[PDB]
Specification:
Shape: globular
Strand order of the largest sheet: 1-2-8-5-3
Helix content: 40-55%
GO biological process, one term: cholesterol catabolic process
Strand content: 5-15%
Order of helices and strands: HHEEHEHHHHEHHHHHHHHHEEEEHHEEEE
GO molecular function, one term: cholest-4-en-3-one 26-monooxygenase activity
Protein name: Steroid C26-monooxygenase
Family: Belongs to the cytochrome P450 family.
Bound molecules: protoporphyrin IX containing FE, the ligand CCOC(=O)c1cc2cc(-c3ccncc3)ccc2n1CCN1CCOCC1
Structural class: alpha+beta
Radius of gyration: 21 Å
CATH class: Mainly Alpha
Pathway: Steroid metabolism; cholesterol degradation
């Protein structure tokens, strides 16, 4: 049929778009008129990839099919981040293959099995009481300030305290850990143009290898002991593997959950009836609707290892496919009234945590618990908060970020 009604040269990974808005109408146009669509990229404008473009994947069922078929659609070949600075060196993309996220089987399979010791339901549930205490304090301290930046005073700290608590990081080191974590993303935004994620990664790995050495000497009530201890078949994280895991956690669990909190509260501000129902019932289904609505990871990519026919479209070996979770989470064929914010939506088969498959977010339930604890604390301590001014968005081609949002906690 006809081509989609998009501006000439539109690129759905363009950071200049996301600094201003989510391209919600453009995604809906692809879903209607071209659900799998070749997004061409001009020479030098591919965000670190130099292959002419990629396939835009806009439907939830296609996102799931790609995610299940990891034997064909590789994470390792080009990594899963679909946009960097246009001048990034290929070596700086390939160095990212040392984190589990950018590995294929069998290397990913081994690493995932070991790391799963650190994300058992018991390990995550063991954080519930401390994270609930920290959430209440964060909301109380924010409310006491009267007004301020909701992103910084409500959204930022609890995700970072969740990473620190999972890892057993001493309190005197958590300032350093949070700094390194915050220096890992956003470097295409002018506000963060001076951050040095390579230097931060190196500092994190060095810190993490020292922690691995020390925690072998004395096991503690952390997951670190379970990670670096050989099983019957001698499987464990080496010290440097633990380091690359910490680098991966510092990124994976920080600005993702943060942006679900900020955009969850933005949704509540825009849907007062849902906020009144939340305060009354406190339904934990709200966390999944908040993740669906916030879709903190706009997109991850894969690379075809062989020719593959997807929904009538011939994907060719070597081509990239970009899974736009932000489109799939509003797919009219899957969700009843996708553009209604409904905190009771159940079941909620969103792909905010990815499509079901080998790389499905291992921190999904830790993320949901963090969200539920902070929004209970917000409801307890600042039930009448009202926005002061519009959110400032993050210039990124794959992360859907809010840098700042002024709020009157008093109302
Ligand atoms: C709302 C918050 C979060 C969102 C939206 C999110 C989203 C995602 C997505 C989209 C993926 C890729 C899934 C795929 O490719 O199929 C992923 C993977 C991953 N996430 Fe999360 N995540 C969140 C929170 C967290 C937290 C809190 C942690 C840990 C503290 C975490 C750890 C990981 C790890 C380790 C992976 C890699 C898994 C693998 O490659 O096998 N995430 N996440
Ligand atoms: C060798 C250092 O490992 C990285 O670098 C790295 C890890 C990482 C993890 C995620 C991630 C996001 C969401 N869920 C799970 C994982 C995303 C990006 C990641 N990176 C790349 C950092 N980049 C920043 C700027 O440019 C250099 C690369």
């Amino acid at each position: 049929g006809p081509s989609p009604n998009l501006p000439p040269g539109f690129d759905f990974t363009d950071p200049a778009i996301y600094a201003e808005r989510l391209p919600v109408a453009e995604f809906a146009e692809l879903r209607s008129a071209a659900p799998i669509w070749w997004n061409g990229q001009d020479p030098g404008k591919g965000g670190g990839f130099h292959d002419g473009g990629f396939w835009a994947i806009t439907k939830l069922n296609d996102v799931k099919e790609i995610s299940r078929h990891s034997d064909v659609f590789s994470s390792y070949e080009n990594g899963v981040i679909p946009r960097f600075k246009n001048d990034i060196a290929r070596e700086d993309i390939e160095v990212q293959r040392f984190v589990m996220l950018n590995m294929d089987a069998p290397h990913h399979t081994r690493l995932r099995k070991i790391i799963s010791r650190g994300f058992t339901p018991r390990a995550v549930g063991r954080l519930h009481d401390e994270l609930q205490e920290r959430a209440q304090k964060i909301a109380a301290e924010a409310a006491a300030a009267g007004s301020g930046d909701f992103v910084e005073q409500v959204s930022c700290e609890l995700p970072l305290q969740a990473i620190a608590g999972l890892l057993g990081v001493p309190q005197e080191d958590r300032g350093k850990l949070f700094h390194w974590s915050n220096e890992m993303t956003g470097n295409e935004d002018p506000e963060y143009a001076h951050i040095d994620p390579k230097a931060s990664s190196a500092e994190l790995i060095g810190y993490a290898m020292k922690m691995a050495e020390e925690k072998a000497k004395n096991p503690a009530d952390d997951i670190v002991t379970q990670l670096i201890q050989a099983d019957i078949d001698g499987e464990k994280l080496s010290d440097d593997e633990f380091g690359f895991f910490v680098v991966m956690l510092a990124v994976a669990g920080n600005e993702t959950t943060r942006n679900s909190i900020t955009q969850g509260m933005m949704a509540f501000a825009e849907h007062p009836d849902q906020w009144e129902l939340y305060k009354k019932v406190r339904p934990e289904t709200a966390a999944d609707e908040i993740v669906r609505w916030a879709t903190p990871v706009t997109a991850f990519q894969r690379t075809a290892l062989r020719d593959y026919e997807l929904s009538g479209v011939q994907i060719k070996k070597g081509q990239r496919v970009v899974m736009f979770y932000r489109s799939a989470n509003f797919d009219e064929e899957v969700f009843q009234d996708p553009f209604t914010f409904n905190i009771l939506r159940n079941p909620n088969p969103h792909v905010g945590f990815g499509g079901t498959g080998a790389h499905y977010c291992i921190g999904a339930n830790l993320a949901r618990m963090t969200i539920n604890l902070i929004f209970n604390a917000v409801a307890d301590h600042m039930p009448d908060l009202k926005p002061i001014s519009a959110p400032e968005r993050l210039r990124s081609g794959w992360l859907n970020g809010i840098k700042h949002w002024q709020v009157d906690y008093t109302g």
